[PDB]
Paper text:
Upon activation, the RNase activity of Csm6/Csx1 enzymes, catalyzed by their ‘higher eukaryotes and prokaryotes nucleotide binding’ (HEPN) domains, provides an auxiliary interference mechanism to facilitate invader clearance and may induce dormancy or cell death.
Consistent with this, 2′,2′′,2′′′, 2′′′′,2′′′′′,2′′′′′′-hexa-F-c-hexa-dAMP (cFA6), a cA6 mimic containing 2’-fluoro modifications in all positions, was resistant to degradation yet still capable of allosterically activating EiCsm6, albeit more weakly than cA6. The structure reveals that EiCsm6 adopts the canonical homodimeric architecture of Csm6/Csx1 enzymes, with extensive dimerization interfaces between the CARF and HEPN domains. The cFA6 ligand exhibits 2-fold rotational symmetry coincident with the 2-fold symmetry axis of the EiCsm6 homodimer, with nucleotides A2-A4 binding to one EiCsm6 protomer, and A1 and A5–A6 to the other, and is surrounded by CARF domain loops comprising residues 10–21, 39–41, 76–82, 111–116, and 137–139. The 2’-fluoro ribose moieties adopt the C2’-endo conformation in all positions, while the adenine bases adopt the syn conformation in nucleotides A1/A4 and A2/A5, and anti in A3/A6. As a consequence of the C2’-endo ribose pucker in A6/A3 and the positioning of A1/A4 in its binding pocket, the A6–A1 (and A3–A4) dinucleotide is forced into a conformation favoring an in-line nucleophilic attack of the A6/A3 2’-hydroxyl group onto the downstream scissile phosphodiester group to form a 2’,3’-cyclic phosphate trinucleotide product.
Numbering used by the authors:
A (entry chain A): -1 to 141, 148 to 322, 341 to 430
B (entry chain B): 0 to 141, 149 to 321, 331 to 430
């Protein structure tokens, strides 16, 4: 229930040879197309010493004889060099573009047996390049009688009767595996750069992929995970009882992704908020009721340790900056202190790009290195706050990439 | 550079009608260092109209016109010699092998010899793995070859080809691969996947304008990554560096929002808004804001008529409020200085996503567009930014909001 158009070169074994259909007629016979576009070289239509010339055969009559209500279209071109790819690259491209234009829902069947061998290769290369609603059909030679214009009508019905008890010699060839490889090698490099939307895009387009449904599912889940800051289901299963761990872990993974990919300005802006979330929970865990919230926003309480309250005042007269102040007073030059310093080294640099909208310059005053130390600090802190986190889960993205490649 | 010839064999080989066949002709005019001949077992065995290709001395024939040539003969059993299946994996194995042991060698493929499927397979391979490969065609020059008269037939063939042209042509079919990559790239630009588009353009050396496409794609990539103002904006709006940066971020903001990235959109809209109003308060109420230490602090003496009003707003005196100005303060000052004019409604839309911003930005919560119509408020907060930007900077031209749309069409046209 669709329009079937056949594009068919024409060769010396057409319309038939040895009382057996020629490649063009055999596709017509076994596929019954609604439209047929024939392409004759000027030289094979006129003729040479060894061949009468294809203008002698009534092409519309022969095709409609075995295919009812078949629309036929003859194309004839002058080709100075008939084995030259250049003569067919653009000529065949322009014809098929016209058929696709006129009949967008039609199925296009290409004869890759008729004409010169380079006609086969050009149609096979067009197909590989534009596979949609297109397919290549090959007709095999039967495993000496020549087509005669003078004896057309008799020969046709002889060929009919001999073909009535013979099996089909048409075979839909399988060469889209070549296009698949081009796309496969392209997707591998996209995955390494965390270009998952682009990976999905190339995968979606390639209907050939044997594991397409699984690939598309895993990619979309991850893509939406990234966009809405959703914890990865794997992280949900690994750490089911600690949602606070899950979220700090998702962000540290995404933070390292952005930094690795070159989204450095992006990285710098988000380092602090993740650093704040991990320090916030560090304070709850080891000095619990120091923090008090009435509208879900950290507020410093003095009743936890009144004496310590006054020591902050001593320091002040002389949020992350507050946690950093609190902590150093309770414990100085310890594991946690020297990590939050490195996050504070970019505090004022973060303000420039976050709130003054300025550009980022790694070249100036050792700037990029300052960002790398801050990222490293976030990982080092996360492990101190949540000792249950496994170092091997930091490679979730690299592990996800590899699992996808093996599916490609 | 080492030159490797992978040539199938056909019936016209080694020679026909006193002129070379496809293989020997490429051999003559290219002098490869290594030749790999591929034979179907059927053509090797024969016994149909001839004794088979085994009767010829391929090593002796090929080295007769190529002094230093190491020749590998591969023979395989092919049940159906017109079936792509038997060649597309087989030939792939052979070419992969040659490249592994000879990584810097040029691969010359004979596309003329054998059945058409051998021609088409090798062309499909080259289109797929073009690096260091090329396809050579031998045209017919316009009495078959027997093995009993080898050494005389070779000499005859040699003397007659001495005075004949090259007859070998390097095919140009890499346009097909270029058309595959071209349409891959068009979609990538549509989604703003510039790094992926650069990858795909860089992989395709054939691209006529790849050098221009690459330098333009890297500039934009770096400007987005490092938040560098578009040079076009620098030239189109000089002497207002504040406008330049507010405009860049409004484009990056809208870019993010249009392609998803809704959680990253949510966090940034507030910071770009606070920037726009800050320059709106400077421009309209000079010295209302004082930058006491590289941050917007409030001027308690700018105007005492509404300095009491701000105090009155805070449910005790002015000694306490030396806190850096943020978005709430700006909004507070503007509802006392004006009465719900075009600007306070726009700021309200940004305020409409404030609770959601903290939730996502600072508590690290996930984003849901379906729930509580959060996607609809977010969209309103982005429009508000672009609307404020136009009020604070009337100078800005509306058509510059399509900068990315235009950049993609420029890259597309060059493809
Ligand atoms: N019923 C029936 N019957 C029959 N048949 C049939 C049927 N149905 C179906 N079918 C199918 O179809 C097809 C046929 O074809 P046709 O159509 O006929 O076509 C032809 C023609 F016609 C065309 N043309 C030409 N011209 C023209 C024009 N104008 N227009 C249009 N068209 C045309 O083409 C074709 C061919 O012919 P030729 O002659 O060759 O031609 C050539 C040239 F001449 C041309 N031209 C033109 N013009 C020009 C100019 N100006 N210039 C230049 N040129 C030119 O072109 C062409 C080309 O081609 P190529 O290939 O590329 O080339 C060639 C030549 F030329 C070259 N060279 C160089 N040098 C030289 C010298 N010195 N001398 C000479 N020559 C030369 O080289 C080449 C050659 O080749 P070879 O090597 O020979 O190869 C062959 C053979 F041998 C192979 N084989 C076979 N077997 C084997 C084995 N085992 N192994 C290995 N190998 C082999 O192949 C080939 C072919 O042959 P054949 O016979 O055909 O074969 C077939 C079959 F039989 C097979 N097989 C086997 N087994 C089997 C089985 N089991 N199954 C199945 N099958 C088989 O395979 C094949 C197939 O093929 P196809 O095509 O696809 O198909 C056919 C049939 F079958």
């Amino acid at each position: 229930n669709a329009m079937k158009i056949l594009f068919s070169p024409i060769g010396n074994t057409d319309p038939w040879r040895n009382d057996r259909d020629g490649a063009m007629l055999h596709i017509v016979r076994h596929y019954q197309p609604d439209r047929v576009v024939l392409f004759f070289t000027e030289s094979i239509w006129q003729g040479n010493q060894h061949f009468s010339g294809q203008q002698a055969f009534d092409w519309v009559k022969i095709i409609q004889s075995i295919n009812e209500n078949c629309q036929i279209e003859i194309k004839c071109d002058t080709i100075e060099v008939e084995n030259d790819f250049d003569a067919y690259k653009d000529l065949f491209h322009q014809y098929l573009v016209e058929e696709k234009r006129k009949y967008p829902n039609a199925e296009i069947f290409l004869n890759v047996t008729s004409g010169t061998p380079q006609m086969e290769t050009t149609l096979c290369l067009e197909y590989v390049t534009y596979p949609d609603k297109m397919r290549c059909i090959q007709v095999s030679t039967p495993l000496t009688k020549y087509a005669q214009a003078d004896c057309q009508e008799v020969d046709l019905e002889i060929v009919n009767e001999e073909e009535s008890q013979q099996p089909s010699r048409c075979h839909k060839i399988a060469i889209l595996s070549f296009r698949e490889a081009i796309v496969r090698n392209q997707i591998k490099s996209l995955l390494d750069n965390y270009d998952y939307e682009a990976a999905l895009q190339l995968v979606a387009s390639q209907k050939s992929f044997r594991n397409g449904k699984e690939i598309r599912k895993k990619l979309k889940e991850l893509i939406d995970d990234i966009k809405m800051h959703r914890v990865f289901s794997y992280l949900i299963k690994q750490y089911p009882r600690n949602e606070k761990l899950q979220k700090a872990l998702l962000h540290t993974i995404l933070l390292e992704m952005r930094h690795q990919r070159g989204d450095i300005a992006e990285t710098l802006i988000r380092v602090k908020s993740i650093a704040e979330y991990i320090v916030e929970q560090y304070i709850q865990k080891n000095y619990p009721y120091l923090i008090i919230y009435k509208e879900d926003k950290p507020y410093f309480n003095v009743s936890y340790s009144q004496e310590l309250t006054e020591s902050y005042l001593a320091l002040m007269d002389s949020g992350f900056p507050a946690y950093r102040d609190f902590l150093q007073l309770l414990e100085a030059s310890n594991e946690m202190t020297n990590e939050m310093n490195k996050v504070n080294e970019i505090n004022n640099l973060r303000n420039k790009v976050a709130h003054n909208l300025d550009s980022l310059n790694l070249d100036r005053d050792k700037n990029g290195r300052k960002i790398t130390n801050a990222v490293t600090a976030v990982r080092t802190m996360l492990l101190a706050v949540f000792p249950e986190v496994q170092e091997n889960d930091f490679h979730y993205l690299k592990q996800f990439n590899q699992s996808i490649k093996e599916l490609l």
